[PDB]
Amino acid sequence: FKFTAQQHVYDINGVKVGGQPGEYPTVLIGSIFYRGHKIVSDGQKGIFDKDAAKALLDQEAELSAETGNPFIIDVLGESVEALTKYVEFILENTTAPFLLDSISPDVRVGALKNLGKDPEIQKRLIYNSIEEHYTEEELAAIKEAGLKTAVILAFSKKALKPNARIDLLQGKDDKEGLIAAAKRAGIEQFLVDPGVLDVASNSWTTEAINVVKEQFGYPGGCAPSAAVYLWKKMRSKGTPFFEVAGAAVFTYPITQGADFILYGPMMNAPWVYRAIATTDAMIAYNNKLTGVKMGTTEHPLLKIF
Amino acid sequence: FKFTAQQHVYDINGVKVGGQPGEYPTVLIGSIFYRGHKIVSDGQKGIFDKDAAKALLDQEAELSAETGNPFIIDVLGESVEALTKYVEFILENTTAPFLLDSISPDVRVGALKNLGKDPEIQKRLIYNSIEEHYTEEELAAIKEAGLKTAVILAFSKKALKPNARIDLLQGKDDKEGLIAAAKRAGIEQFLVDPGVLDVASNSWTTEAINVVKEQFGYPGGCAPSAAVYLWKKMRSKGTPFFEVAGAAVFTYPITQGADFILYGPMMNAPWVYRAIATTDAMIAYNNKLTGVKMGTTEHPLLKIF
């Protein structure tokens, strides 16, 4: 299958994201300094294991080189002080782009203030996320930082149908669309995450990704990790049950033409990369029938066999 | 996914197979007495550990009850003596349908000859397979047995592309094709397996399954286990890398609307059931969008969470 709209392929400090199915490998986004991460001893001050963080980053580079799946780091923080330190460390200890990420918007806003309108921040920092309840101070913070790429969380807990993403992105009635809001903050590149409620509803998330790519061509992806970790029945079964079950959830959106996955904790990268790379290789082999051409030689199809 | 043709749903001794995606759970087909299966002490005579074989069968029943994925047993033999004894054991020690399976047509034919005319054989035994080298003797033997269900195997290194596998199935030029051959043997129910050449080309297998369901409405599935076991680079990595990779391969045809998977050795059932059930739950959650109704309450979506 192929999408009608010409697909946006963004180049985020070397990382290609988007395209027609089989054109580009899945971009894999691993979480670090998340709530309960054992390498963080104090989430308020940002006291973290630099050796263990470096080792996770080096492992991501090695898996990325093995499969050809590019990586963006999901950097989480619970305070301005902590997320600022986390971001400074990520900037120095990898070349990867990264998500500035937090549960609390005020943590993202505060961290942007500290980081300033640094040209490296504009090239490597992706705002996570512009959500339905965005504030003017949030858009001002993004604009002062001079950011160019954001995750658009195209999720409304009152608008669960895939077709409603057209309304959320474009706007409807008196409501400014999320794309219009991002553009006001100076954002030019939109990674669309339609949101995941639970594991089963990942099928609606992936259908929403298809609508967005079909009609607008923005790269589409999602973040099923929270839904997988709340599946206590699977998680307590141990190896390899939790891993294959996770693999089934994380690969599913890719089988329907999604462009990126937030796969959760980076410690799971070794099995996530191998499953995702397997799905990419099979999708790209289908190119041979569709005439769709790979946009890079760094593709799992040419690497993992 | 929703398929053009009206789908054929077979009821094989209580096991539902086929339909629109999300209508019925994936049927999982585990292999027993395969080459090198260590519970077999003599593969020529069919001497095996009956308690160990019973333990695999009981485990399949337990996993099936957990997820709601029905099971058919893939019963392999390398001799008429062995496959006859294997079939007699499976008849008495499970209620499940099974594949009468051998690489050697002579072994399949010989074993079928031993089993005679038996309504239990006609209801439970699925011939594996009607394939490109079929003989009139083999069709006559199937007709004498009064079998009604067969695996139609389009695996041929003279039919690599999906549309060439459809030509093998429906017939072309001087060939009646595999479906026409099965019908002359009195087969009325066709489980179509386009074959797996290698891991990457599981997408071509899946494209062939899609054409079958689009045009004919016959249940479609495949047997990717050999291709996964021959993947030295991935298998070398061990647990859980081999399994998540295997799960990516086995779930992929299900994400594109396939009806059944031969997942290889029954010992792998514990992780195969957990991955496949996960994909099924996500597919069934789509049912409102596709306009599909579940045909049963025994569905992973209603059981595994």
Author numbering:
A (entry chain A), B (entry chain B): 2 to 306
Tell me, in the authors' exact words, what the paper reports.
During energy production in Desulfitobacterium hafniense, MtgA catalyzes the methyl transfer from methylcobalamin (Cbl‐CH3) to THF in the catabolism of glycine betaine (GB). Despite its lack of sequence identity with known structures, we could show that MtgA forms a homodimeric complex of two TIM barrels. The topology of each subunit is characterized by a funnel of eight parallel β‐sheets connected by α‐helices on the outside that form a complex of two perpendicularly oriented TIM barrels. The active‐site cavity is located inside the hydrophilic core of each barrel.
